[PDB]
Write a protein that binds this ligand. Structure first.
Ligand code: F6C
Ligand code: F6C
Ligand code: CLA
Ligand code: CLA
Ligand code: CLA
Ligand code: CLA
Ligand code: CLA
Ligand code: CLA
Ligand code: CLA
Ligand SMILES: CC1=C(/C=C/C(C)=C/C=C/C(C)=C\C=C\C=C(C)\C=C\C=C(C)\C=C\C2=C(C)CCCC2(C)C)C(C)(C)CCC1
Ligand code: SF4
Lengths: 31, 80, 139, 65, 29, 137, 42, 46, 46, 739
């Protein structure tokens, strides 16, 4: 029994947090 | 542009100046050698970096050294 | 303005390009004792006129090759001059810079990019870290 | 044969196998090299030795190039 | 120069090689 | 003691190869030599071990024979090269072999192990470090 | 059936849209962004 | 004639003569004593 | 010439032989060479 | 000029397409950036390392998420020996029905890939059982990566940017990384094995919901504090234990049995727990060696600069001058990176050599394709790391080494006899190459002429003796551990060889890879490997030691690490830079690792087939490798698709040709050189300018790739084709004949 629809959607929303922080770090390193 | 330096071991044989295909080098008065002249590189903006001058230099080690640097249109030898 | 008659040439594919009209162009002028056939720097043969000639070339190396290896070495013509022409019309004569050919020593020429040591005494790059000075440029 | 029926050396596989270079790799290079790859301990063993000799010189040349 | 410190370490290391070869040749167990 | 190698004359796999071998010059006598003298593996092929105090001459004879010949060639070339250095045109002596000099170098190289020992003891074998061309560090 | 791409996993419609998006929808706009970035005059 | 003798002492000529002479020696050793192997040299034929 | 071979490899790997450049798929008949063969055969009367 | 690249005005003023190429190539060379200071160099690197750590955690999160989402982990638990693990689903809209059916397997109803990384076996051993547990781990790694991404941004803010002195404080960093990063992490992992993994292997579920009140051992922590440590080793798992069940399961948490679990054929979980317990203690002790803030502890600078050995005057350690080295390493990031890459390269080789022989994961030794993939993966990575160690060693010589502060020390001595080092490495390479190749072709001619008995077949007696010394009684030797009466086997004073009965059982088991039997075929290939190791070292060492200069180029240090040449003068100077030696060494590293992985794969293929005699009789001549390994095992790979249909190997067939194509393209970049293409590009420039309706025009003037860039691009195609071609063959030839 693999993960459900809600778990996949939750992982997508959670992955936004490292996504935005990756952008912040990349732009900071560009300075 | 490339950087062309002339060191004190130059013997003033004028061979580097004759070998230059873009007239970067000229011979100037000097007193450090019997020929009483030394190579100079006043026009390094026209230097392409072919290193023909180093090939022509008879001293050991080279009295003239070319250091390839920032590339421009004329240093890349571009007719376009 | 640069005066002279262009050599007889039927056209070629190795002539000037957009760079001549946009960034810079070069012109080589010389005087010949007779009408004779020479080789264009970018391929093909052209006929230089009886009087004084004027040739437009894309690169400075073309003028040094034509004037140095053909005009002087082959046709015994020693009065060729190379000009740099800008799109705005400004023209400066760049070869020979002071009227004397560079291979012949001329008084009043300063020493440019001369290092007062043998090449083996250049400092190690570790000594010049974070200073922006190359070993060959070190005092 | 006596009836005029022709069986070809590779059975007419050029039309369907040569249109891909996997077919060239498999049905031409791999399949038709069986004779030279299995020529050891036979009269064709010289061709087997020269098959490896050619491979050696090709790789050897890459050092210079 | 006899190289004292050089040859002492060399002899010690060579002694280990001989000792291992002794076990390998069934001279000692 | 080693048990995975047995004498070839007692290896059934080797006997199968011996029986099935072609009856030519290349297999008649060599197979008999392998049977008496060689140790065979489970595949029936002779194997050369280095874990035997016995048959040590089987290891030392080929090794010593090669080292003497290789040293003979090396000493012939070295002594010939050293003799041509004093010549006016040593390079010309290398594309043109000097027969009297080559024969002399070859003759002395027969006793190369003795000559090399004498040169090493007298310090003539090697040149000093400071007298050898090197590149800047 | 095995005549089409399917998914027994949760939200199998996600590869149906994400594969086109990442591989042949967004990459050209992304290349345009990078191209503008690397060609900007100082 | 002395020029021909000088030619025969050339490095390629001497290398060819030496290589051929050594090749012949090794070839005849294969004909007279085929199948020589490590652990078999200088042993009597069984 | 070559990229259509790569096209054929990908179509065959996909299990889509009908999309290949082949006699049984998208045909590329060398009609001019076929025409020459017919002309040269009919020239002698065969 | 252009804004891009921000770090180089010299590139930003370049009017050609070379500007874009070189910006990407020098973006991470922070030391050459415009106006770069030493403090800003370390601060930028420190934040970059946070980004790389986050990328690793995101990568591990993706592996976990796709298995929990599209894999078959729970089904694979019930039958690990017969169920194919699923990597992820396939969504390629260009698939046809035959391709969809071919890739629909392993119990799935959609096309899937078969995992070959071994993560199923790893997660199974460490106690993971459900897809929800994998999902929670994936979510946790997403948050962990977010933490490190924030940390990198935080440590770039003005108040949190560390000073240069903080980066240069070597002793506190060594103390914390030994005791804390290595020791405490090892202790925490042993805790996970004791508290979670071991109970889960005995049918008992331990998770965050019940681990606080579920002791791992009946004796509890009282046995630890009272000195009754032997209670933890009592009642181990029985030889009839069934993994993931309580049948035949003991209660011990720290045993030292040795050998393998009889069913899983992998290392005992309780053995691994005691391993990381002992490792943690050793590394925590090692983390107290150097002085930081309390006087006690060694000073590395003092140890290197020391000149007195209990009063006696010595040059230094081993009577060798090590003075001035502390500043050399501490100021050279390339010197530190060289050691770090070399250590990781050796560790990656040791991982490959020890994971196949002593599998640490349940049933992973029976997943033949996974075993081949993991060994090849970590050996090739090790080879790349080894090249990098010497590459940055050559960079150290040019950029960070100065003779004045290293005068007369051990580093200077190496540079002063570089000719002896290089010439002797050349001799070893020539000796190995002449005789290894010569013996191969001698065996080639004998076998070809029907005289296989006339082959030279040198027995690897020295390595066979080592195997016997480790307990392998097959060879008949009676030395050390293969001799039960030997003092090594008995351990006469204490008889504490509680490892030996398990170790000997695994050593003499004929069904595992622990000390595989070796014959003459194994002797020759190790000497091929030795040749590859010595030549690749020769190319790398010669480049590093000649980086400062040579007779041909005395002033090479003034030109940098990577330059094309010094012109056609002085005979010609192609590939003269130290970078070019690293470029040449990658070819030899690929060739050496090719020989290594060819040998590992063919030997294991014969064993898995049940045809060990094939390898033993054919590996002694090169035609046996070419015929019975390459030609023989390519048959099923190249039939992944054919005029009759497609199977699951169609991807490895297409990738097999894709690797050959990339390899072929590299030859163009490597054989043809720049000036040919620059002249061709000039002709195309003319054509574009004279063609109507072509309104486009280059903002960057098109130029041929630079001389150095061509070597890099060609090497990249050569390497990518090398890896892709062999990876496809390795997977297809093993998975096509097995699970
Ligand atoms: C931009 C613009 C432009 C234009 C317009 O405008 C053009 C045009 C021309 C004409 C004139 C001619 C004819 C055409 C053809 O056929 O070929 C091509 C094809 C195609 C397809 C090309 C392409 C086209 C265009 C590009 C289009 C685009 C569109 C798209 C879609 C976009 C997309 C975008 C996204 C974002 C991705 C040509 C050519 C040539 N090219 Mg050339 N281009 C250009 C671009 C480019 C680049 C980038 C490069 C690099 C890669 C090159 C390259 C090349 C070479 C090698 C050659 C040859 O050989 C040729 C010749 O010379 O002959 C004679 N070139 N061209
Ligand atoms: C390193 C490596 C290697 C090695 C090491 O070890 C070797 C060795 C062997 C042996 C064991 C034998 C016999 C020995 C003798 O002879 O013995 C007598 C003598 C004496 C005792 C002594 C002698 C001495 C001398 C004379 C001295 C001089 C030398 C010189 C210097 C050399 C140089 C010269 C030149 C060469 C010309 C043999 C033989 C064979 N082979 Mg074999 N090898 C090889 C190489 C090779 C290659 C590449 C190939 C291809 C070509 C082949 C081929 C062949 C064939 C076909 C055959 C035959 O048949 C034989 C037989 O049977 O087997 C069994 N393989 N081998
Ligand atoms: C003249 C005889 C001679 C002698 C005594 C040596 C001696 C040496 N060479 Mg050497 N070499 C020679 C010729 C010789 N070389 C020639 C002709 C070449 C060109 C192919 C080389 C190429 C060479 C390389 C590339 C290397 C050596 C190395 C070495 C050293 C150890 C390995 C060795 O013995 O070489 C083994 C032999 C070879 C590698 C090839 C030589 C084989 C040729 C065919 C011998 C020719 C002999 C000559 C024609 C006889 C003429 C004599 C006659 C006029 C009387 C050692 C100092 C190695 C080194 O520096 O290690 C420290 C190393 O890397 N040599
Ligand atoms: C680095 C980890 C990683 C990797 C390599 C992959 C790989 C893949 N994913 Mg995936 N995924 C991941 C993490 C990862 N996943 C995570 C954490 C999630 C939960 C948010 C998802 C959710 C997800 C969905 C919903 C789908 C895929 C799909 C796919 C496949 C097609 C690519 C795609 O559509 O991307 C889609 C990617 C996302 C929706 C988000 C990815 C988020 C990760 C963390 C980004 C990682 C960025 C990376 C580290 C930076 C690279 C730096 C650069 C220098 C290389 C491919 C096998 C598709 C598939 O299964 O096709 C069959 C699909 O539909 N993924
Ligand atoms: C026209 C040819 C073509 C095209 C365009 C595609 C396109 C695609 N196929 Mg595909 N395929 C084809 C032919 C083709 N296929 C054929 C002929 C077969 C055999 C029948 C297959 C079999 C096949 C399978 C079995 C799978 C695909 C998948 C995919 C998708 C992933 C993209 C990809 O393949 O890698 C594109 C690669 C990248 C974009 C690289 C990502 C960037 C990273 C960061 C690079 C990092 C490099 C790495 C670190 C270094 C090497 C590491 C390595 C050693 C492990 C994509 C939709 C996969 C899928 O479903 O994806 C969801 C999948 O599982 N295909
Ligand atoms: C106990 C305390 C502690 C711990 C756990 C760490 C942990 C770490 N430090 Mg660290 N550090 C510490 C104290 C500590 N530090 C102190 C006191 C200082 C100041 C002296 C530093 C200064 C410092 C710098 C300057 C850097 C680190 C970096 C790192 C990371 C290295 C990358 C990695 O994951 O390695 C892998 C971890 C493993 C456990 C694998 C080891 C397995 C090996 C191969 C087997 C042997 C790692 C997370 C680097 C970084 O930025 O990372 C973000 C870095 O550049 N540290
Ligand atoms: C032939 C050598 C080889 C082999 C067999 C493997 C085997 C493996 N690697 Mg691997 N790897 C290698 C060399 C190799 N590695 C090298 C040299 C690098 C450095 C770049 C990597 C970097 C690497 C990463 C970053 C990852 C792996 C992973 C894996 C595992 C899953 C992928 C797989 O099935 O095999 C690989 C099968 C192949 C056929 C390899 C070739 C794949 C492509 C086609 C190569 C070309 C890349 C791309 C197309 C070109 C640029 C775009 C597996 C154990 C993955 C892992 O850990 O699993 C969780 C993972 O994430 N590898
Ligand atoms: C932790 C390991 C590590 C670290 C921190 C570094 C760091 C550095 N290396 Mg180094 N290196 C390493 C490992 C490492 N390397 C290894 C293992 C090797 C052996 C292969 C090398 C070989 C090497 C050479 C030969 C050179 C460096 C250079 C450099 C410096 C500049 C980086 C650069 O050129 O810009 C960034 C460069 C790139 C991004 C290169 C592009 C990518 C290449 C072509 C790989 C091809 C991509 C492939 C298809 C897919 C990969 C995945 C994809 C996501 C990229 C920098 C300090 C250079 C230097 O200091 O100049 C003086 C230099 O010349 N290194
Ligand atoms: C099949 C391919 C191949 C082969 C055989 C070699 C062989 C060699 N390379 Mg090499 N190399 C190659 C490809 C190859 N390379 C490629 C593609 C690259 C990338 C550019 C390199 C890069 C490279 C570097 C950077 C270095 C080498 C070195 C070496 C030598 C070390 C091994 C040795 O001494 O063995 C012994 C010699 C051999 C096995 C060569 C074959 C000898 C033949 C068989 C003797 C036959 C004699 C016979 C009479 C000839 C017939 C007559 C004929 C002349 C007409 C050796 C000559 C190293 C070196 O020179 O160190 C000494 C070194 O530094 N190579
Ligand atoms: C027992 C044995 C073994 C082993 C051995 C060994 C281990 C050895 C070592 C050795 C060594 C460790 C050595 C060293 C050396 C050193 C040096 C240093 C040298 C030198 C030399 C020289 C110098 C030479 C010279 C010469 C001569 C004499 C002649 C010719 C010429 C020449 C010049 C070359 C084996 C198993 C193999 C086999 C069996 C037996
Ligand atoms: S060629 Fe060399 S020696 Fe002659 S003038 Fe020029 S720099 Fe001086």
């Amino acid at each position: 029994m693999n993960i459900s629809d809600t778990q996949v959607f939750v992982a997508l929303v959670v992955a936004l947090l490292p996504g935005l922080l990756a952008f912040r770090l990349a732009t900071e390193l560009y300075k | 542009s490339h950087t062309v330096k002339i060191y004190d071991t130059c013997i003033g044989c004028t061979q580097c100046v004759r070998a230059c295909p873009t007239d970067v080098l000229e011979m100037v008065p000097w007193d450090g050698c019997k020929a009483a002249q030394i190579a100079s590189s006043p026009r390094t903006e026209d230097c392409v970096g072919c290193k023909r001058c180093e090939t022509a230099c008879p001293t050991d080690f080279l009295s003239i050294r070319v250091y390839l640097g920032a590339e421009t249109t004329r240093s890349m030898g571009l007719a376009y | 303005t640069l005066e002279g008659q262009t050599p007889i040439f039927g056209g070629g594919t190795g002539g000037l390009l957009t760079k001549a009209e946009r960034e810079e162009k070069y012109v080589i002028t010389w005087t010949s004792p007779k009408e004779q056939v020479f080789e264009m720097p970018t391929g093909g043969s052209a006929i230089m006129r009886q009087g004084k000639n004027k040739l437009e070339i894309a690169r400075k190396e073309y003028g040094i090759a034509l004037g140095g290896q053909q005009l002087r070495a082959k046709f015994k013509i020693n009065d060729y001059k190379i000009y740099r022409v800008y799109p705005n019309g400004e023209t400066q004569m760049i070869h020979p810079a002071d009227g004397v050919f560079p291979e012949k020593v001329n008084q009043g020429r300063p020493k440019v990019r001369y290092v007062d040591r043998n090449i083996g005494s250049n400092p190690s790059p570790a000594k010049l870290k974070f200073s922006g000075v190359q070993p060959y440029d070190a005092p | 044969d006596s009836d005029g029926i022709v069986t070809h050396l590779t059975g007419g596989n050029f039309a369907t196998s040569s249109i891909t270079n996997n077919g060239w790799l498999r049905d031409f290079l791999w399949a038709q090299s069986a004779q030279v790859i299995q020529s050891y301990n036979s009269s064709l063993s010289a061709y087997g030795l020269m098959f490896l000799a050619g491979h050696f010189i090709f790789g050897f040349s890459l050092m210079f190039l | 120069a006899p190289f004292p410190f050089r040859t002492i370490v060399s002899l010690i290391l060579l002694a280990g090689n001989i000792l291992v070869a002794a076990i390998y040749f069934h001279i000692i167990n | 003691a080693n048990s995975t190698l047995v004498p070839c004359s007692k290896s059934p796999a080797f006997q199968a190869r011996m029986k099935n071998a072609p009856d030519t010059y290349y297999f008649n006598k060599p197979f008999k030599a392998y049977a008496k003298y060689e140790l065979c593996g489970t595949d029936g092929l002779p194997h050369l071990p280095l874990d035997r105090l016995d048959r040590a001459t089987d290891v030392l004879v080929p090794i010593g024979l090669f080292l003497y010949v290789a040293g003979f060639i090396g000493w012939s070339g070295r002594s010939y090269l050293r003799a041509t250095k004093s010549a006016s045109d040593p390079e010309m002596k290398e594309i043109f072999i000097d027969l009297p000099l080559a024969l002399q170098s070859i003759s002395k190289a027969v006793l190369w192990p003795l000559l090399a020992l004498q040169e090493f003891l007298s310090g003539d074998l090697t040149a000093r470090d400071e007298e050898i061309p090197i590149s800047p560090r | 059936d095995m005549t089409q791409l399917t998914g027994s996993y949760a939200a199998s419609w996600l590869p149906w849209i994400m594969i086109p998006l990442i591989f042949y929808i967004l990459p050209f706009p992304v290349f345009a962004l990078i191209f503008i970035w690397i060609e900007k005059e100082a | 004639m002395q020029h021909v003798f000088k030619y025969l002492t050339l490095a390629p000529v001497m290398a060819t003569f030496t290589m051929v002479a050594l090749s012949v020696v090794l070839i005849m050793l294969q004909i007279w004593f085929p199948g020589l192997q490590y652990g078999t040299y200088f042993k009597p034929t069984p | 010439s070559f990229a259509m071979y790569c096209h054929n490899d990908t179509m065959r790997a996909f299990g889509r032989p009908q999309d290949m450049f082949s006699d049984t798929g998208i045909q590329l008949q060398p009609i001019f060479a076929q025409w020459i063969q017919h002309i040269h055969t009919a020239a002698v009367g065969a | 000029a252009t804004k891009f690249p921000k770090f180089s005005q010299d590139l930003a003023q370049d009017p050609t397409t070379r500007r874009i190429w070189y910006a990407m190539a020098t973006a991470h060379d922070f030391e050459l950036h415009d106006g770069m200071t030493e403090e800003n160099l370390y601060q930028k690197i420190f934040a970059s390392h946070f980004g790389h750590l986050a990328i690793i955690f995101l990568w591990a999160s993706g592996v976990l998420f796709h298995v929990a989402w599209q894999g078959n982990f729970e089904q694979w638990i019930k039958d690990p020996l017969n169920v194919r693990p699923i990597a992820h689903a396939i969504w390629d809209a260009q698939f046809g029905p035959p391709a969809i059916e071919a890739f629909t397997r392993a119990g799935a109803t959609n096309p899937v890939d078969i995992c070959y990384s071994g993560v199923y076996h790893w997660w199974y051993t460490i106690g993971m059982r459900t897809n929800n547990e994998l999902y929670v781990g994936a979510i946790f790694l997403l948050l962990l990566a977010a933490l490190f991404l924030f940390a990198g941004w935080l440590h770039l803010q003005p108040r949190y940017r560390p000073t240069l002195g903080w980066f240069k404080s070597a002793e506190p960093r060594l103390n914390h990384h030994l005791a804390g990063l290595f020791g405490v992490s090892s202790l925490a992992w042993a805790a996970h094995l004791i508290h979670v993994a071991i109970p889960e292997s005995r049918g008992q579920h331990v998770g965050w919901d019940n681990f606080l009140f579920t002791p791992p051992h009946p004796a509890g922590l009282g046995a630890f504090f009272t000195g009754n440590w032997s209670a933890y080793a009592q009642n181990p798992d029985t030889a009839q234990h069934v993994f993931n069940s309580s049948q035949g399961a003991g209660t011990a948490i720290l045993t030292f049995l040795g050998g393998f679990h009889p069913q899983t054929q992998s290392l005992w979980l309780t053995d691994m727990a005691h391993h990381h317990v002992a490792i943690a203690v050793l590394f925590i002790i090692a983390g107290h060696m150097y002085r930081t803030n309390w006087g006690i502890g060694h000073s590395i600078k003092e140890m290197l600069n020391s000149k007195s050995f209990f009063g006696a005057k010595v040059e230094g350690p081993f009577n060798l001058p090590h003075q001035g080295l502390y500043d050399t390493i501490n100021n050279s990031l390339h010197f530190q990176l060289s050691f770090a890459l070399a250590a990781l390269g050796v560790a990656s080789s040791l991982t490959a050599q020890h994971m196949y022989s002593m599998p640490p994961y349940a049933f992973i030794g029976q997943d033949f394709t996974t075993q081949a993939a993991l060994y090849t993966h970590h050996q090739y990575i090790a080879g790349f790391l080894m090249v990098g160690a010497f590459s940055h060693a050559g960079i150290f010589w040019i950029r960070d080494y100065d003779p004045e502060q290293n005068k007369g020390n051990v580093l200077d001595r190496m540079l002063r006899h570089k000719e002896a080092i290089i010439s002797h490495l050349s001799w070893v390479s020539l000796f190995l190459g002449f005789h290894t190749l010569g013996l191969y072709v001698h065996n080639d001619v004998e076998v070809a002429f029907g005289a296989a008995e006339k082959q030279v077949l040198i027995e690897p007696v020295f390595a066979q003796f080592i195997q016997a010394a480790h307990g392998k009684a097959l060879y008949g030797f009676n030395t050390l551990l293969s001799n039960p009466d030997s003092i090594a086997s008995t351990a006469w004073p204490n008889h504490a060889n509680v490892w030996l009965p398990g170790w000997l059982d695994a050593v003499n088991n004929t069904t595992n890879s622990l000390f595989l039997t070796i014959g003459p075929g194994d002797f020759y290939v190790h000497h091929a490997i030795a040749l590859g190791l010595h030549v690749t070292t020769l190319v790398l060492v010669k480049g590093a030691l000649d980086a400062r200069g040579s007779k041909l180029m005395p002033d090479k240090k003034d030109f940098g690490y990577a330059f094309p040449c010094d012109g056609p003068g002085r005979g010609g100077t192609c590939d003269i830079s130290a970078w070019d030696a690293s470029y040449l060494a990658v070819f030899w590293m690929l060739n050496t690792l090719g020989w290594v992985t060819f040998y590992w794969h063919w030997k294991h293929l014969a064993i898995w087939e049940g045809n060990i005699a094939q390898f033993n009789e054919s590996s002694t001549y090169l035609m046996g490798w070419f015929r019975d390994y390459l030609w023989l095992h390519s048959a099923q790979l190249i039939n992944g698709y054919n005029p009759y249909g497609t199977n699951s190997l169609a991807i490895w067939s297409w990738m097999f040709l894709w690797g050959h194509l990339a390899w072929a393209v590299s030859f163009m970049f490597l054989i043809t050189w720049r000036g040919y293409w620059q002249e061709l590009i000039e002709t195309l420039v003319w054509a574009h300018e004279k063609t109507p309706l072509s309104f486009g025009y280059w903002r960057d003037k098109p130029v041929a790739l630079s001389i150095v860039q061509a070597r890099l691009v060609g090497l990249t195609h050569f390497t990518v084709g090398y890896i892709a071609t062999y990876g496809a063959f390795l997977i297809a030839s093993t998975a096509g004949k097995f699970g």
